[PDB]
């Protein structure tokens, strides 16, 4: 159920080499809150990859601490997938967290590396969140 304390979800960015604006994945519910993958080009140059939480809510009283593993899937060999971990207290003023320079744009888009296929790159997040505060009183 959505009240689960953790989950793993993926989002495949298409026409990746042409990415020019920030993109958002559909939500994955954990602790009944919507979590989304956020991807964006940063400085071509680097791939920005962040985890977002409950960003559309108007509430300013919520907070949810969580740890997560952000990974870009290598479709040829999982062991070659690149990941980084985060630990963050998500709340309305800091509703997303990750790396603006998760990895080199030239590397991810390199056809010989195995991260991109048919100009698509799959992002994955394994999030483990604690019970939130200021949400379900």
């Amino acid at each position: 159920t959505s009240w689960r304390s953790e989950a793993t979800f993926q989002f495949t960015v298409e026409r990746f080499s042409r990415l020019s604006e920030s993109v958002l994945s559909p939500p994955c519910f954990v602790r009944n809150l919507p979590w989304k993958i956020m991807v964006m080009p940063r400085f071509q140059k680097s791939v920005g990859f962040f985890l977002q939480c409950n960003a559309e809510s108007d509430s300013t009283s919520w907070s949810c601490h969580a740890q997560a593993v952000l990974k870009i899937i290598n479709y040829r060999d999982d062991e070659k997938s690149f990941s980084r971990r985060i630990s963050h207290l998500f709340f309305h003023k800091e509703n997303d967290w990750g790396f603006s320079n998760f990895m080199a744009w030239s590397e991810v888009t390199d056809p010989e590396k195995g991260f991109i296929d048919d100009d698509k790159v799959t992002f994955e997040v394994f999030v483990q969140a604690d019970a939130p505060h200021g949400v379900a009183w």
Partner: peptide, 6 residues
């Protein structure tokens, strides 16, 4: 790499 918000 240091983490941060977007």
């Amino acid at each position: 790499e240091k983490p941060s918000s977007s």
